[PDB]
Structure 1
Amino acid sequence: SISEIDRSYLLSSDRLTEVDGNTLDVASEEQVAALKAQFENLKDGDEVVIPNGKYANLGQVTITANDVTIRAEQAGAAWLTGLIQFELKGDDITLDGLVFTEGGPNERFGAVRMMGNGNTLQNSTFYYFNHDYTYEPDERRSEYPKYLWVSLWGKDGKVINNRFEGKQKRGTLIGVQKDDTPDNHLIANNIFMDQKPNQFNEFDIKEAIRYNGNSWEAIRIGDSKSSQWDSSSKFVNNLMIDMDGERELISIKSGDNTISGNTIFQSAALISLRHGKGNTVENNMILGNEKRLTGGIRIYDEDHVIRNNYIANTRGRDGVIEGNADLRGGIVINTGIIDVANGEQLDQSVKGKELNKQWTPKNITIENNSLVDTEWGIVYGNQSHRVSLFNNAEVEGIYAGVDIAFKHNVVDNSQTPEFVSVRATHDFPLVGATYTDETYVGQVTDSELIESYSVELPKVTVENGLNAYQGEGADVSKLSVVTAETAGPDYVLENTTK
């Protein structure tokens, strides 16, 4: 039952083999060199099968061949340590069953740079791959370097059935580096665990905290320069546990993406529609389990669809680092810095309103969500933005969300009705908000901004440990918890080192 879920349950499956790292032999400098030549002399259609063992410091491994598979002889038993980057330049390259641990990326765009079309990373495990690369506050501004683990630069990439555990230095774990056309990447059925910041005193440098405490996402799809183009990528059916990197768990920074059906458990980080248009966030199960600074989804930009999510037991309103508009709750409609009600846009040529700034939300559909025991439920934004991560001046000119349509949502704080189910604010009234058959039980601040809603719960049943509200809220038929029965590789590792 929902409240009783824990990591052990989420991570258990009888399908999983144990791979003992202690039973693996360390390849010699000679054997590593030989493995390396094999990689680089591949012909199209070939396979490289890596004998069980631990292989230190492969370094820069460039794959130019098409239609090749690089795989462990036994899944999980080819451990790649020290510095390594697979740079996948050919099309239709598959990496399969690899382990990256006790080492770090040889170049900052990750252990795996998926640059061709149809590249795949599957059944693989990253375990605390935070080591061996220089990691210092820089001379210019005391900024620590961002190192990713996987990056996607081509088309039709798939990152499926992997485990990405313990990313604990700065940098997004997966980055999509796209161009002007749709990418159609699939990031699905992965396990993400234990990302967290400030494990190496990065935050001790107080003047640099706004940026040093930023760029710890689990995934970033697109970026500010590319954000006004469609990616059409999918982040679906993933299991995320104790992912606490930063304010954004997932940063969507491009258009037409799907972020749906993921289970997000005790993660102090929000799905963030940061830049770009027309993104859809549906059927996710966000189970905060009462952990501080958990939350659902925060929203900038236009045309998004947020429907049928189940967001439960979340806590906390204000992130610890200031000036980053870090306002949390179940669903947060951010302020931005442009007058969208009069058609204003962000624009790379307009000083102060560049594409990396804050697009006031507009034309948002928020329907059939169930928010259960959320300390801050639907939060209408009031943040004051800074000019940039590096300029701490406050922007004068802050606007509220526009044309926000709420329908059939249920915010059920019947357990602790002192919790704020809907946080409206006369400081920033929404413009053209509509309310259709909303149900809000618990505190509603500035309720006179809201035309109508019901304060009486429909009939409530429990189906599969979820609340089902008769005729309203998230349809529980569309919802299920992702566990290691479908997510992650088909093995677990023993005798690893952080």
Structure 2
Amino acid sequence: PSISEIDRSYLLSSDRLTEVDGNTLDVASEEQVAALKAQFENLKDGDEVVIPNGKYANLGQVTITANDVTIRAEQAGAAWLTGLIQFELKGDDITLDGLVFTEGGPNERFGAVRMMGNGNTLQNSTFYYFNHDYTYEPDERRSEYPKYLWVSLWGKDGKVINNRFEGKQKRGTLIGVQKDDTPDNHLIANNIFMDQKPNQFNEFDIKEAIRYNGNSWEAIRIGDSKSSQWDSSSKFVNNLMIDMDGERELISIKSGDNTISGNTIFQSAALISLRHGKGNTVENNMILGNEKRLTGGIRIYDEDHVIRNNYIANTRGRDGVIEGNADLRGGIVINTGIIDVANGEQLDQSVKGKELNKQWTPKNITIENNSLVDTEWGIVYGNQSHRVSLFNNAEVEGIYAGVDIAFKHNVVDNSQTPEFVSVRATHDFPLVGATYTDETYVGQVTDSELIESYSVELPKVTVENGLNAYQGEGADVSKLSVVTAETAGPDYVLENTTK
């Protein structure tokens, strides 16, 4: 299967996968649910709970205080936890293994799994449309729907690995990292994410509330505005993402020193977003839009980031549907911001209008050896207007272009449809101190006079296992590979599920 022919059956297929039939599982009685629950809360260090095959409704608030415990399905995929539940993991070195969360929802808004301890792990588990049973209504203050997460990490050295997160379709980031002032070193790797999408419950019908109701549907948010000026040093690596269309941000990085690398992002109308925080690296990802509307690569605020060796193909669309959220899309988008970083200006919680949750003009960004192939909007130099907040629609006055953006060895290849815009420069917001080394742009370049030099001649193109390899330029195909269910997600698939 070569790039343009990839589809979800290929990505999700593997011989290694067992099939678990939900219809073969018995529904635990109220008495048995209670018995399982006491087992959880009576755990001593070093013990294990093995959950017999079955469906367990409304376990509710499950607090694990023990350390070095495993809670696992007796057969992977065959312990289905339904109705309202939250595992509150307070101990260290707690592992949840082979669980299913479906036909129900989190018992508290920070998720079915609150990883509060250190060395907590969630593995081989599946969430299937876990959007139910909790109250979900526009609030009285401002008709805002509540944000419910599925997994949150509040400790150190968490792992979320080999899980399947399918069908998140009510508001709230699917995974949230809530961190303090020191590195977290979490690993979120080898997971499958599918079919996150907004406005399935008429949320957007309240027109006045759209800018915030249409926000907070990320697949993962690492950090938050208050914690954003500290390092997380977390990794979001080797994941497979299919039809993830939650909002403009697929992955919202809001802290420093993170790695967002080697993921395959297929037909997802949502971008990797370096939203707050410094020194993040986005590398070796395969972003395959497959001509789907409003697909895109990476959008960039703040400083010192490295964007290297990504392969971004067949993406489409420039303007997101909700206005006022700077939702400008393309392969790689250098956003405008609201602070004069060329003169050393910072966001600062004390400075009114320039608080840490606002928009840090990008500076000192290295963008090197990327291949953008058949991208309708390739490298887009930002021109967004910004509003005071998600709740205040006034426009900010004073908008700045990216600074010290260093472009080297990128290939933007629109030779197939050269009317597509390979590089969108703009005299409305000229980059400051931008540099160009051995760039190759084929296709429309707007306000091209702003760019010192580039080549319009593609080097020798070979197809090396389905990818375009450009001789001596662009993404090195040796560092790239498509993630499939051969390595991503759990070791089983479920049947007879209900959305």
TM-score band w.r.t. shorter chain: over 0.9
Provide Cα deviations, 1:173-194, integer angstroms capped at 9, x if missing partner.
0000000000000000000000
1:213-237 Cα deviation digits (max 9, x unpaired)? 0000000000000000000000000
Is 1:113 matched up with 2:107? no
Distance 1:471 1:108 in 2: 49
1:22-53 CA distances to partner (integer Å, 9 max, x unpaired)?
00000000000000000000000000000000
Q: Distance in 2 between matches of 1:41 and 1:227?
A: 38
CA deviations on 1:428-480 (whole Å, 9 max, x unpaired) are 00000000000000000000000000000000000010000000000000000
List 4+ stretches of structure 1 deviating above 6 A: none
* Corresponding residue pairs, total: 498
> 1:263 and 1:460 mapped to 2: Cα distance?
22
1:456 is matched with: 457
**Residues of 1 paired with 2:464 and 2:51: CA distance?**
46
| Structure 1 residue 140, shift from structure 2 partner | 0.2
Per-residue CA distance 1:195-244 (angstroms, 9 max, x = gap): 00000000000000000000000000000000000000000000000000
| Deviation for aligned residue 1:371 | 0.0
- Give how far 1:393 is off: 0.1
Deviation at 1:95, TM superposition (A): 0.0
SS of aligned partner of 2:342: helix
After superposition, the C-alpha distances for 1:308-362 in whole angstroms (9 at most, x for unaligned) are: 0000000000000000000000000000000000000000000000000000000
* Deviation for aligned residue 1:256: 0.0
Query: What is the deviation of 1:155?
Result: 0.1
Q: Secondary structure at the match of 1:416?
A: coil
- 1:411 deviates by 0.1
Residue 319 in structure 1 maps to residue 320 in structure 2: yes
CA distance in 2, matches of 1:272, 1:290: 20
Q: 1:66 offset after TM fit, Å?
A: 0.2
User: C-alpha distance in 2, partners of 1:367/1:158?
Assistant: 30
RMSD of aligned alpha carbons:
0.1
Distance 1:264 1:337 in 2: 30
What SS class does the counterpart of residue 493 from structure 1 fall into?
strand
Q: CA deviation at 1:406?
A: 0.1
Question: 1-side partners of 2:3 and 2:349: how far apart?
Answer: 45
Q: State the partner residue of 1:493.
A: 494
| Separation (CA, whole Å) in 1 of partners of 2:465 and 2:481 | 8
Q: Aligned equivalents of 2:385 and 2:204: distance in 1?
A: 22
| Shift in Å, 1:164 | 0.1
Partner of 2:342: 341
Structure 2 CA distance for aligned equivalents of residues 236 and 222 of structure 1? 17
Provide the rounded CA distance (Å) in 1 between the counterparts of 2:495 and 2:238: 25
Question: Do residues 400 (structure 1) and 404 (structure 2) align?
Answer: no
Q: Return the offset for 1:401.
A: 0.0
Deviations 1:78-114 (A, max 9, x none): 0000000000000000000000000000000000000
Once the two structures are TM-superposed, the CA of residue 152 in structure 1 deviates from its matched residue by 0.1
Tell me the SS of whatever aligns to 2:359: coil
Match in the other structure for 2:205: 204
Q: CA deviation at 1:262?
A: 0.1
Q: Which runs of 5+ in 2 are unaligned?
A: none
Shift of 1:263: 0.1
How many angstroms does 1:293 deviate by?
A: 0.1
Q: Within 2, Cα distance between the matches of 1:299 and 1:332?
A: 6
- CA offset digits 1:410-442 (Å, max 9, x no partner): 000000000000000000000000000000000
- Mapped to 2, the partners of 1:397 and 1:269 lie a distance apart of 27
Q: Give 3-state SS (helix, strand or coil) of 1:82's partner.
A: strand
Distance 1:270 1:364 in 2: 17
Rounded Cα–Cα distance in structure 2 between residues aligned with 1:115 and 1:293: 36
1: CA distance between counterparts of 2:327 and 2:102? 32
| Distance in 2 (alpha carbons) for counterparts of 1:78 and 1:41 | 19
- CA displacement at 1:288 relative to structure 2: 0.1
Identity %: 100
Q: Secondary structure at the match of 1:33?
A: helix
Query: Which whole-Å deviations, capped at 9, do the CAs of 1:362-419 have from their partners, x for residues lacking one?
Result: 0000000000000000000000000000000000000000000000000000000000
Q: 1:246 corresponds to which residue? A: 247
Q: Counterparts of 1:42 and 1:99 in 2: how far apart (Å)?
A: 21
Residues of 1 paired with 2:38 and 2:261: CA distance? 41
Equivalents in 2 of 1:322, 1:281: separation in Å? 26
SS in 2 for 1:314: coil
Partner of 2:446: 445
* C-alpha distance in structure 1 between counterparts of 2:132 and 2:4, whole Å: 36
Alignment partners' CA distance in 1, 2:465 and 2:55: 43
Distance in 1 (CA, whole Å) between partners of 2:391 and 2:495 is: 43
- Counterpart position of 2:274: 273
Structure 1, residues 95-134: CA drift from partner, whole Å, max 9, x if none?
Answer: 0000000000000000000000000000000000000000
Secondary structure (helix, strand or coil) at the match of 1:225 reads helix
Q: Hey, what's the Cα distance between the residues in 2 that align with 1:322 and 1:393?
A: 13
State the Cα distance separating 1:135 from its structure 2 match. Answer: 0.1
- Structure 1 distance, partners of 2:498, 2:179, is 34
Instruction: Provide the rounded CA distance (Å) in 1 between the counterparts of 2:41 and 2:418.
Output: 63
Residue 419 (structure 2) aligns with: 418
Gaps of 5+ in 1: none
Report the Cα offset of residue 252 of structure 1: 0.1
Q: What secondary structure sits across from 1:65 in the alignment?
A: coil
Aligned-pair distance for 1:2?
0.1
Partner SS state of residue 91, structure 1: coil
Q: What are the equivalent positions in structure 2 for 1:459-474 lying under 5 Å apart?
A: 459-474=460-475
Tell me, yes or no, if structure 1 residue 23 matches structure 2 residue 1. no
